[PDB]
Amino acid sequence: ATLKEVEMRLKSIKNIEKITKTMKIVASTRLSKAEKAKISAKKMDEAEQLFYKNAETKNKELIVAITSDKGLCGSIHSQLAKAVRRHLNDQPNADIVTIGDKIKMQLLRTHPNNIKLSINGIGKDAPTFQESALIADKLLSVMKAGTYPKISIFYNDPVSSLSFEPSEKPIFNAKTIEQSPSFGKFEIDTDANVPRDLFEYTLANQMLTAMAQGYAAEISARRNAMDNASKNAGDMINRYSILYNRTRQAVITNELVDIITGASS
């Protein structure tokens, strides 16, 4: 009654606890592979960035942002949402390309005008070159990315294994590459299509890395969140346990009193 309604509710809490435990462990499992990938990806990125640094490439605009289809992976969604909004005060009329549903929903509310391209099916997998390449190819063809001589991408840098700081970086347009001065301290033919190629190649290489950084933060966030969930659920187990014990005793006593009263008569 009380006892049974307590008991089912405590059971619900128990089932939740079990799930949050299971999920948290599996999150840890997923996290190890994710981190491994991110290293290799980041190493590749650094080699290209080495060119861009040495080149000192410098800089409507594009905003690209990434947050997976799936949720319950901390505040990745909303910290990134807040930082997009901050940089949407830096150009109100900028065109937002949302890579994955979760960031799509939040920004779509904040400005629905700016949502121009969006990508579904992101969250399912761990980042891959195939995805990055096609998203890029579509960014070039569909969004005519080069027209906007500022491109900036947002992702979640997994700052520490317990933290994530939403981060952005600037993708270097072919125009930037052209007019960067220490571009001239590297050499290739004028008949080369290298400005238009090199732009494209780092559009994708940076994007894949951005996705990888984000994905690791996502899986990490999910581990953190599910861990904190287990703790919160445990506390609820304890609160309902005391209630259960008290309720159980009270029922025995009250029923007994009735039996006694009857016997007394």
Partner: protein, 116 residues
């Protein structure tokens, strides 16, 4: 509604509904966090947290015990205060601001105190 005016009843209805939402989301709030609440709901929750805090009004006989001078707030004033809160007019200020003070005017003034 007839007895105490439709507007009062409407205001009160909305307060009751809001608080009931907050009570409903007590489960979700505990089991998960606050960020795992829907954005629309999260606004409601923030409003409701304000409403709860707004309800604390010092008493003059308890002025000693609380250590805060009492507050007597007019019925017309009360209706005004809740009306505003439901429309989130002054909502953008601390929940400590709403806590232990009188009417909306007092809340507004205490926001300045807290802001310093």
């Amino acid at each position: 509604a007839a007895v105490v005016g439709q507007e009062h009843y409407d205001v009160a209805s909305k307060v009751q509904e809001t608080l009931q939402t907050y009570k409903s989301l007590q489960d979700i709030i505990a089991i998960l966090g606050m960020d795992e609440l829907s954005e629309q709901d999260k606004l409601t929750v923030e409003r409701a947290r304000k409403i709860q805090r707004f309800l604390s009004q010092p008493f003059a006989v308890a002025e000693v015990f609380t250590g805060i001078p009492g507050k007597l707030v007019r019925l017309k004033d009360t209706v005004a205060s809740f009306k505003a809160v439901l429309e989130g007019k002054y909502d953008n200020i601390p929940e400590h601001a709403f806590y232990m003070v009188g009417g909306i005017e007092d809340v507004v003034a205490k926001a300045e105190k807290l802001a310093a």
